[PDB]
Amino acid sequence: ALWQFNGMIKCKIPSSEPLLDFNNYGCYCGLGGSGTPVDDLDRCCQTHDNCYMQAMKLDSCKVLVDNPYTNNYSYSCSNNEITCSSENNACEAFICNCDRNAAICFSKVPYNKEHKNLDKKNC
Ligand SMILES: [Ca+2]
Question: Subunit comment for this entry?
């Protein structure tokens, strides 16, 4: 869910408030997304959106009424490393991996303040 995703990002970027820093960034970081990613961070978000769409296609996820945003899963942050739990059932395990991948992606690319709250006229 959103609360676990927030924590994974802070796990990799301890100085951030991910729900403030990465929401509404580019054409893809935030709800929805279309167009050509504006930079590599925006591309991390595009990949993440695709991952969520893929999760949605899984039989296992289609059984739950809960979408990725509210679907809770278990993970730990230790020494700034993220570990998705073996106790997650298939859907939750898939979503946890989508989240883990984006958090690490976010921690490896430049952050461009001029892409924050981007006019979706660029998308
Ligand atoms: Ca998005």
Answer: Monomer or homodimer.
Binning the chain into helix, strand and coil, the percentages to the nearest 5 are: 45, 10, 45
Which residues lie at CB < 5 A from ion ligand 1? 28, 33, 49
**Phi, psi for 29 (deg, rounded to 5):** -80, 95
Residues annotated catalytic, as ranges:
48, 99
| Residue with tokens 């970081």, as numbered in its chain | 29
Q: Total domain count for the chain?
A: 1
DSSP H or E run through 49: helix 40-57
Nearest CA to 61 out of 87, 84, 91 is that of: 91
And the tokens for 30?
């935030």
User: What values do phi and psi take at 48, rounded to 5?
Assistant: -60, -45
| Domain residue limits at 91 | 1-123
d(CA 16, CA 88): 27
Backbone angles phi, psi at 63, to 5 degrees: -90, -25
